[PDB]
Design a protein around this motif. Structure first.
Motif, PDB file in Angstrom:
ATOM      1  N   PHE A  63       2.478  83.882  -6.233  1.00 53.84           N
ATOM      2  CA  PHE A  63       3.705  83.644  -6.967  1.00 53.84           C
ATOM      3  C   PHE A  63       3.722  82.250  -7.588  1.00 53.84           C
ATOM      4  O   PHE A  63       4.723  81.525  -7.522  1.00 53.84           O
ATOM      5  CB  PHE A  63       4.920  83.858  -6.053  1.00 53.84           C
ATOM      6  CG  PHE A  63       4.916  85.192  -5.350  1.00 53.84           C
ATOM      7  CD1 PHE A  63       4.401  85.317  -4.067  1.00 53.84           C
ATOM      8  CD2 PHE A  63       5.371  86.323  -5.996  1.00 53.84           C
ATOM      9  CE1 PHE A  63       4.355  86.514  -3.442  1.00 53.84           C
ATOM     10  CE2 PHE A  63       5.350  87.541  -5.358  1.00 53.84           C
ATOM     11  CZ  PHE A  63       4.851  87.633  -4.078  1.00 53.84           C
ATOM     12  N   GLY A  64       2.605  81.880  -8.189  1.00 53.33           N
ATOM     13  CA  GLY A  64       2.525  80.628  -8.928  1.00 53.33           C
ATOM     14  C   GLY A  64       2.238  79.404  -8.075  1.00 53.33           C
ATOM     15  O   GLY A  64       2.151  78.298  -8.599  1.00 53.33           O
ATOM     16  N   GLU A  65       2.062  79.599  -6.770  1.00 49.44           N
ATOM     17  CA  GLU A  65       1.883  78.498  -5.829  1.00 49.44           C
ATOM     18  C   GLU A  65       0.519  78.512  -5.181  1.00 49.44           C
ATOM     19  O   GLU A  65       0.054  79.547  -4.726  1.00 49.44           O
ATOM     20  CB  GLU A  65       2.957  78.551  -4.745  1.00 49.44           C
ATOM     21  CG  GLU A  65       4.350  78.377  -5.294  1.00 49.44           C
ATOM     22  CD  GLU A  65       5.419  78.300  -4.233  1.00 49.44           C
ATOM     23  OE1 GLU A  65       5.163  78.716  -3.078  1.00 49.44           O
ATOM     24  OE2 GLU A  65       6.538  77.823  -4.567  1.00 49.44           O
ATOM     25  N   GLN A  68      -3.042  77.931   1.133  1.00 46.91           N
ATOM     26  CA  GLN A  68      -4.279  78.029   1.923  1.00 46.91           C
ATOM     27  C   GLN A  68      -4.035  78.762   3.228  1.00 46.91           C
ATOM     28  O   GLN A  68      -2.963  78.639   3.828  1.00 46.91           O
ATOM     29  CB  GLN A  68      -4.826  76.638   2.241  1.00 46.91           C
ATOM     30  CG  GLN A  68      -5.175  75.790   1.026  1.00 46.91           C
ATOM     31  CD  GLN A  68      -5.916  74.525   1.415  1.00 46.91           C
ATOM     32  OE1 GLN A  68      -5.722  73.981   2.513  1.00 46.91           O
ATOM     33  NE2 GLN A  68      -6.745  74.029   0.513  1.00 46.91           N
ATOM     34  N   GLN A  89      11.582  79.816  -0.512  1.00 47.73           N
ATOM     35  CA  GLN A  89      10.841  78.700   0.077  1.00 47.73           C
ATOM     36  C   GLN A  89      10.652  78.884   1.592  1.00 47.73           C
ATOM     37  O   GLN A  89      10.639  77.921   2.353  1.00 47.73           O
ATOM     38  CB  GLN A  89      11.558  77.388  -0.231  1.00 47.73           C
ATOM     39  CG  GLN A  89      11.504  76.994  -1.716  1.00 47.73           C
ATOM     40  CD  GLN A  89      12.752  76.285  -2.197  1.00 47.73           C
ATOM     41  OE1 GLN A  89      13.730  76.146  -1.462  1.00 47.73           O
ATOM     42  NE2 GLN A  89      12.728  75.835  -3.446  1.00 47.73           N
ATOM     43  N   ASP A  91       8.025  80.509   4.651  1.00 48.72           N
ATOM     44  CA  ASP A  91       6.583  80.448   4.841  1.00 48.72           C
ATOM     45  C   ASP A  91       6.034  81.872   4.866  1.00 48.72           C
ATOM     46  O   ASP A  91       6.700  82.791   5.329  1.00 48.72           O
ATOM     47  CB  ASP A  91       6.233  79.720   6.151  1.00 48.72           C
ATOM     48  CG  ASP A  91       6.519  78.220   6.101  1.00 48.72           C
ATOM     49  OD1 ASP A  91       6.616  77.650   4.988  1.00 48.72           O
ATOM     50  OD2 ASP A  91       6.643  77.599   7.185  1.00 48.72           O
ATOM     51  N   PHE A  92       4.821  82.059   4.356  1.00 48.42           N
ATOM     52  CA  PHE A  92       4.174  83.359   4.453  1.00 48.42           C
ATOM     53  C   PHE A  92       3.638  83.591   5.853  1.00 48.42           C
ATOM     54  O   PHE A  92       3.129  82.680   6.495  1.00 48.42           O
ATOM     55  CB  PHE A  92       3.028  83.506   3.453  1.00 48.42           C
ATOM     56  CG  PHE A  92       3.482  83.678   2.041  1.00 48.42           C
ATOM     57  CD1 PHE A  92       3.517  82.583   1.182  1.00 48.42           C
ATOM     58  CD2 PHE A  92       3.866  84.917   1.562  1.00 48.42           C
ATOM     59  CE1 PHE A  92       3.938  82.734  -0.134  1.00 48.42           C
ATOM     60  CE2 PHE A  92       4.289  85.062   0.240  1.00 48.42           C
ATOM     61  CZ  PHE A  92       4.314  83.967  -0.597  1.00 48.42           C
TER      62      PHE A  92
ATOM     63  N   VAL B   5      -2.236  77.639   6.810  1.00 45.18           N
ATOM     64  CA  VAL B   5      -2.557  76.258   7.127  1.00 45.18           C
ATOM     65  C   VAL B   5      -1.257  75.467   6.936  1.00 45.18           C
ATOM     66  O   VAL B   5      -0.435  75.826   6.110  1.00 45.18           O
ATOM     67  CB  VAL B   5      -3.715  75.755   6.214  1.00 45.18           C
ATOM     68  CG1 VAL B   5      -4.025  74.299   6.465  1.00 45.18           C
ATOM     69  CG2 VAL B   5      -4.953  76.572   6.461  1.00 45.18           C
ATOM     70  N   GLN B 152       9.429  77.552  13.956  1.00 42.11           N
ATOM     71  CA  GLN B 152       8.006  77.514  14.325  1.00 42.11           C
ATOM     72  C   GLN B 152       7.667  76.394  15.318  1.00 42.11           C
ATOM     73  O   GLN B 152       6.539  75.900  15.364  1.00 42.11           O
ATOM     74  CB  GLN B 152       7.155  77.410  13.055  1.00 42.11           C
ATOM     75  CG  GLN B 152       7.271  78.633  12.177  1.00 42.11           C
ATOM     76  CD  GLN B 152       6.633  78.447  10.835  1.00 42.11           C
ATOM     77  OE1 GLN B 152       5.631  77.737  10.701  1.00 42.11           O
ATOM     78  NE2 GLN B 152       7.216  79.074   9.811  1.00 42.11           N
TER      79      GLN B 152
ATOM     80  N   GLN E  89       8.364  76.436 -12.557  1.00 42.68           N
ATOM     81  CA  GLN E  89       6.999  76.042 -12.225  1.00 42.68           C
ATOM     82  C   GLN E  89       6.679  74.583 -12.551  1.00 42.68           C
ATOM     83  O   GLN E  89       5.770  73.994 -11.949  1.00 42.68           O
ATOM     84  CB  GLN E  89       6.012  76.939 -12.988  1.00 42.68           C
ATOM     85  CG  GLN E  89       6.146  78.438 -12.709  1.00 42.68           C
ATOM     86  CD  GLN E  89       5.695  78.828 -11.306  1.00 42.68           C
ATOM     87  OE1 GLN E  89       4.640  78.409 -10.841  1.00 42.68           O
ATOM     88  NE2 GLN E  89       6.499  79.642 -10.633  1.00 42.68           N
TER      89      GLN E  89
END
Lengths: 164, 164, 164, 164, 164, 164, 164, 164
Positions: A63-65, A68, A89, A91-92, B5, B152, E89
């Motif tokens: 999504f444009g980000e 890692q 915003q 976290d995945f 990460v 988290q 973006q």
């Protein structure tokens, strides 16, 4: 016997898919398979990892980000990881994973949920995720895909689990 | 497996941090790790002392003032000492210590208090400090750091106690 | 995957709970869920009201005393009302409320405060109340419950917000 | 290679040790390791605390008297605390500490002083204590021990720091 | 003489301000003064930097995102830096700056443009930025503020340039 | 009290006005008040119509061309009609109107736009028009006029709405 | 209000009109109003008959030829008869008629057709005739006329039906 | 007259000094005055030699290493020799010398360089040394010292050259 081949394939595209159809996406390389969101309460990106990848940092555009992840695949099969977040915003996280020799993933919009296949072929099964805004879920699909009516999930399961 | 990460490392900065996020600060040298104050009722500076330091006088600048300390670390682990004062002309005292093999400290604003990790790795635990003005607490962070939501905290705990 | 089940269920009981552990209390009927006091500066009773209750008078025994309340729940979810008084002869007031489809409440004694969950599932959050006499807080628990360490709060949150 | 073994293990005893020999005392449980005095100006008792002991009151019999201390050991190593007083009626204080994975402590009468190992293995070192009456220092030794001439202190160093 | 006081102060708030009124915003600390966007083609956040700040890294939360900047203020006056981006973006840039002894900024929605004050007090002047989507511009204001009609701009100017 | 009298009245003239000054133009007869153009993308002529004019054809010279208009003013106030075209061979339209008992109109170049007063006295307000070439706008002014800095717009407004 | 009068009038003339403009022709006498032809597949002449004309033979010159018609007008209004033929030596027929108190007829060349107004005022409507050579249609106009852009047919209709 | 005294005397310590302050170090015996390094490209130790020392070998501990030099001071003043090396295993050389009756040396970090006083009192002057890593230069200071801002360098000058 003579049987029609399933509808498709369609070239990589962006759209808000209609409800009541499975998208059966055929991944032919590693990396991002698709990016799906309603920009409200649902983000899922599927990441493909080839067989026999030792633990290491890999980077993807979701999504444009630039994001890692620590990635590992000990199997002889491909792995397709659903990376989910619930706010713009957040976290995945890896919500679910399909381990597959056939390199097909499935996505259906129906009845207030997004349905997909997870587990390990040839015995992968369906699961679902709730959303409060189904219709506005849009998808950027990075690979060729087919379209199967919800009434034919039996066939979609067969294709997921055993290939075309 | 696919695991994200951390959000970082952010470079050294001066920051009025948001509530409900851990700052996981990664110390790469001895001396002042951070200086945090609201210029009202809360001053904390963390001083890093490397392993196997015999008793000795070390001088640091804390909140613009020169101060000397008698310092010792007879252990094989780094020690991070929280030096606290509750008023502007007040005396510092060593309020808490983290003895760690991993060289990370944590700071969280939550529930009207400031939280940090203390004790000794891999069994360090969190502890809180009161203040009448949580919102105006500003931190000069001397080392790179990561940002982790309180949701988290189990990951933050894992990193404090076992490293990155 | 293999993951341990929660520590419990413990049967209804009376005790002074240890500090540093969440009690995750599982209510299976309307009425008084628990009664907690130090007989000094803290009294909290939790009252459970089922979905879709029209405004009406309900009576309960709270700390040995018959008390009536005007009660209403317009929602499809259960409501768990914290009724507080701060002195032996004081009046009860509804200090905070958890609206929940999962029928679990949380109570932690820690750091001069009693912490609980409030708001609406699946996004309920923590809150706290101060006391000068934490250790002497005793609780009469009317329903089965589980015990979760303070360091596993995210797990407690998950059960509060998504159920067992 | 062929090398002599240590002289010992002598079993628990009361002994007025000769000058110029190390006693290397092998502790196999917690509590009192030894009680050493001349009944004049020197009393030292060594107390052993196992790894991972949270702060609490522990009681010991030292020179026939019941004594309590606030004890903590946050480490994964054993800790051996020298408790000293300089008069019959005086108060005990923690004069030195050996933190050790090898569970051996050392005591030598030499050069008008008493010497012991302190600090943390494998970097423990010797230190001296003054007395006007070295010769009459006698020791109740609660665990088995070895006797090593001072001329072989390097062997004693090795065993303290790396084990038998 | 008898003259009315300004309309305010209004407390920090979030809203889509009406067209045709100047917001005169009163900054009482360094950091983020306000965050304004239509989530389309206009994002402006104003950052306050106190007098005599040596070149240094400062971090801020802007529209929910952690952002660092290299910051300097060589002057005896506060600086209020408008940080702009024109797409979700995009990168932020310092589009314009008010250097001020009075610690007030101004923002008007009018006529397809957002108008603000820039330059140096007591001779600060208006400037504007175009948008295709004025009405949907919403603002999170972090400080108290006053409301002045467009027809009273000279009054707004007088406060910006000479203080309250 | 001592208050200055206006800068004027300047006699009818052709003028390329400076930015940031109101021209307050005082009309003493019906017909063409002024003709303003940059001979590029902006032509405005203001036509004055006395009170109580029944529908009738009036002819004027505008920028050297004869043009007829159907004119009506059923009110007790003068009306000042702005007739605009955006190209050399373009058609005029009535873009804005000022209905006024005080027989003054205003024109300002500011912020890359041309501003005038419209609506009805004593509640006339300013409005703006875009142009790509503000600098080359030249005005043939048929009536005496005053010059007021934009910093004194409140006075200009008072004169427009309540007269000299 | 102030509105420009429509473009014109133009004196009687001969030309090939541009496409995309309505000619609004103002008849001030009986007889031939105009004669339009491409000398290929389109001939239209409009004949005007005054109110209250009993049936009788009247003669007209149409495209240089003397032609007679049996003419009648029982109305209190003027009648404008379109006389059409499709080839050089073909016969004229009355293809359509406008009955009007306003004495204006309309003619537009656009999109492979000639468009005019017919029916009876104040509810006359547009109609069209096809041609394979629109551009070369030339018109001899016997009366004053106005020109109106196709984008302003609304106005043309108004004038046809209600007068100027 | 009333004038501030110098900031100090700070006692012997290890200090990472701030840029833009002079350290004025007051030597009260011979031997090593200070040892300064960034452990990268800069090592300077200052050695003090009393008046009237005949040529001989003297030993010093510099950065934990035993080093000998051939030393002479034929003068009635103290001499302070800067011994420099540019790498970890490089050889020390005498880079600069201060000959002084006042027994004060100076060290400043400023403008990316290290500055010290050299020459002979009362005519000693400053000179600079380059480094790629100024900020990390830390100093073991063996004698008491004062801290003087660079803005007051003239005072530092006076004290070096004429004493406290």
């Amino acid at each position: 016997t003579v049987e029609p081949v399933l509808d498709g394939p369609y070239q990589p595209t962006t759209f808000k898919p209609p409800n009541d159809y499975w998208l059966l996406i055929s991944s032919n390389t590693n990396g991002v398979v698709y990016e799906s969101t309603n920009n409200n309460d649902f983000w899922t990106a599927v990441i493909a990892v080839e067989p026999h990848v030792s633990q290491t940092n890999r980077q993807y555009i979701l999504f444009g980000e630039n994001k890692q992840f620590n990635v590992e695949n000990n199997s002889d099969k491909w792995k397709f990881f659903e990376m989910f977040k619930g706010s713009s915003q957040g976290d995945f996280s890896n919500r679910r994973t399909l381990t597959s020799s056939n390199r097909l993933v499935g996505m259906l919009k129906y009845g207030g949920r997004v349905w997909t296949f997870h587990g390990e072929t040839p015995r992968a099964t369906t699961d679902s995720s709730n959303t409060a805004d189904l219709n506005n879920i849009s998808i950027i699909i990075h690979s060729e895909f087919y379209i199967i009516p919800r009434s034919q999930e039996s066939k979609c399961n067969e294709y997921i689990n055993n290939g075309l």
